[PDB]
């Protein structure tokens with residue numbers, strides 16, 4: 001499962 | 010221009 | 019970094035990101051925080067990007083080594099996993115120390131305070147991923163408590179599409195699934211967050227819509243994996 | 246790394262590569278070299294992989310920063326480019342120091358000696374990429390001299406398909422094109438190397454054929470870019 005990335009990309 | 014990589018990959 | 023100007027540290031953090039030098043980026047941002055002034059929105063993102071990338075690489079390496087160690091079960095694999103683990107814990111402790119001295123206590127606006135408490139939850143979560151000893155339950159509870167305070171503020175002070183509110187819910191749902199052994203809570207939180215954001219999209223401009231829907235897709239991706 | 250066993254350093258270098266921890270990998274391999282024993286074929290590849298990846302990341306960052314600096318033309322971009330440059334030079338100096346104390350002098354077999362002299366040429370080439378001062382010509386000549394000695398040995402002692410001979414010619418051709426301002430020499434060397442290898446492929450097993458043709462493709466890729 002993924003958490004939020006540092007940047008929108 | 011490319012030089013040799015560290016591994017065959 | 020005590021002798022470098024705050025503005026120069028911020029500028030160099032931006033350069034370090036462009037050069038993909040995230041360890042440098044984190045050191046510049048630590049120096050900026052230690053100037054003692056509050057951080058702007060953009061500066062908070064620089065701090066988070068830098069440390070998230072540093073610890074993310076450590077986590078990926080720890081997982082590779084932990085997999086090798088578990089298959090093996092000489093001392094070398096365990097020793098090296100322990101070395102990477104100690105370095106990861108040190109970075110987490112550094113970030114938590116910046117948040118405790120004194121970013122959180124000086125953050126009064128909901129956006130800043132939620133941002134920092136979400137970070138606090140994240141770095142305790144990363145500690146929990148590698149924890150095994152007498153303090154493992156306490157580390158998990160420290161993550162939970164930080165995320166919960168952030169959630170309480172976000173629900174009172176931010177619309178359901180706010181990207182910080184959404185990212186917080188995303189990460190807290192990951193905590194529930196991966197750390198707290200509460201997959202039903204993780205699924206419920208992700209679903210309710212997604213649905214409440216969907217119903218508020220009509221209020222948003224095109225650029226805000228893009229931000230909110232991008233994070234909603236991450237919630238959906240997790241729900242698809244978990245169900 | 247003085248207190249760690251040679252065999253443990255080698256084992257940990259292999260683990261560090263799997264975990265993509267190339268700075269650790271290089272430190273473990275530096276420790277192994279400093280035990281004072283010669284390196285096997287596999288160990289030479291670990292040493293080269295580690296430092297090639299460390300300096301490769303530094304080179305990529307230096308190029309990003311140098312591009313920003315040249316567009317700009319405060320002190321911050323130049324200062325940070327200078328910081329990355331100094332760190333890159335330090336790693337190159339470290340590798341060159343290992344080769345000089347005492348890998349090259351103890352290398353008697355053509356395979357080991359050519360391998361180390363090719364590395365020596367490479368690390369002087371990386372120094373030449375960032376050099377501007379009174380010693381820039383001397384750095385270029387130091388790369389040239391190392392590559393030339395390696396070439397002379399390789400042509401006497403190795404078949405034209407030997408992968409070390411091929412990689413040396415590839416890298417020396419890059420030197421001619423990118424450092425020495427000799428694109429015709431670069432093209433000639435790449436062409437002659439490719440053609441002489443092609444004519445020797447019939448002697449090779451399937452696995453040796455794969456190695457030689459893979460490097461021949463790199464020669465061809467450069468020739469296509471240069472012509």
Ligand SMILES: *Cc1ccc(S(=O)(=O)N2CCOc3cc(OC)ccc32)cc1
Nearest residue numbers: 004005006007008181182185229232233
């Ligand atoms: C936790 C969190 C921090 C920052 C943001 S953001 O400023 O709205 N933003 C930048 C960070 O990453 C990001 C991703 C995204 O879709 C994946 C949308 C917006 C951002 C949001 C949450």
Ligand SMILES: *Cc1ccc(S(=O)(=O)N2CCOc3cc(OC)ccc32)cc1
Nearest residue numbers: 013014015016017408409412456459460
């Ligand atoms: C300079 C050089 C070092 C090592 C070799 S190799 O041992 O034959 N080998 C491993 C390193 O990378 C590599 C690439 C390749 O095709 C791209 C073929 C063989 C190797 C060769 C040259």
Ligand SMILES: [Cl-]
Nearest residue numbers: 022023024025
């Ligand atoms: Cl100041």
Ligand SMILES: [Cl-]
Nearest residue numbers: 056124125126
């Ligand atoms: Cl405040």
Ligand SMILES: [Cl-]
Nearest residue numbers: 249250251252
């Ligand atoms: Cl020993």
Ligand SMILES: [Cl-]
Nearest residue numbers: 283351352353
């Ligand atoms: Cl010898």
